[PDB]
């Protein structure tokens, strides 16, 4: 069984930082692409970040509108996927979603049970 | 980005009533592979976006039949027959052919008397 479950999410000042955690298993998580996604209350679901696994460099992708702010990272041992938000905005509001590729569908098939992000 | 678009937003039908939402894509969703990645989810209140069908018309783990997928290219649409209590939510389509992947602004389907 794939289990993804999100953690860290909160009421929080703009300005402010948030850091948000995945817990995982149920796949081969060294070879995953894992993904935050959020459904913002301004733009629905929107994909926020990627990071590759150890194989591609776990290099790290973004949306333009966090691109600076947010950092994405991973613990391939914990089978864990972060994100720290920054100088979070009221934009950033929303449920956030961890993610990603594994199992039989190379696409986001099963997400967590979200965490909400409240900026005041 | 790859634009998503549902219509309608809001689908008020009667139980037992066929309903039927159309996604359109900005961009043809064929892949160089050849395959079609257009995506639908079924979202319940307080809960995560569930995938229901995959790559167009695949019924996903647990899904009834009531549920039919279809379309090509930049035209696609989602067929509930035979509405129930349980298919109330909202759906989304989505795409997973071109990064990165897009969601279409969700359907609400609902009962009206």
């Known amino acids: 069984e794939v289990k993804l479950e999100e953690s860290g999410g909160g009421l929080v000042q703009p300005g402010g930082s948030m850091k948000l955690s995945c817990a995982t298993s149920?796949?081969?998580?060294?070879?995953?692409?894992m993904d935050w996604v959020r459904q913002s209350p301004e733009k629905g679901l929107e994909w926020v970040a990627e990071?590759?696994?150890?194989?591609?460099?776990?290099?790290?992708y973004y949306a333009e509108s966090v691109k600076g702010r947010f950092t994405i990272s991973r613990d391939d041992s914990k089978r864990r996927v972060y994100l720290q938000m920054n100088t979070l905005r009221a934009e950033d509001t929303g449920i956030y979603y961890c993610?990603?590729?594994?199992?039989?569908?190379?696409?986001?098939?099963?997400w967590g049970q979200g965490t909400l992000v409240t900026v005041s | 980005d790859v634009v998503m678009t549902q219509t309608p937003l809001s689908l008020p039908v009667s139980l037992g009533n066929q309903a039927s939402i159309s996604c359109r894509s900005s961009?043809?969703?064929?892949?160089?592979?050849?395959?079609?990645?257009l995506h639908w989810y079924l979202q319940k209140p307080g809960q995560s976006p569930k995938l229901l069908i995959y790559?167009?018309?695949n019924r996903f783990s647990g899904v009834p039949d009531r549920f039919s997928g279809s379309g090509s290219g930049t035209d696609f649409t989602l067929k509930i027959s035979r509405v129930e209590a349980e298919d109330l939510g909202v759906y989304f389509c989505?795409?997973?052919?071109?990064?990165?992947?897009?969601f279409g602004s969700g359907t609400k389907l609902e009962i009206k008397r």
């Open positions: 993610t990603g590729i594994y199992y039989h569908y190379p696409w986001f098939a099963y």
């Open positions: 149920g796949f081969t998580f060294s070879d995953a692409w």
């Open positions: 990071i590759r696994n150890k194989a591609n460099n776990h290099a790290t």
């Open positions: 961009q043809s969703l064929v892949h160089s592979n050849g395959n079609t990645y």
């Open positions: 790559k167009v018309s």
């Open positions: 989505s795409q997973s052919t071109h990064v990165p992947f897009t």
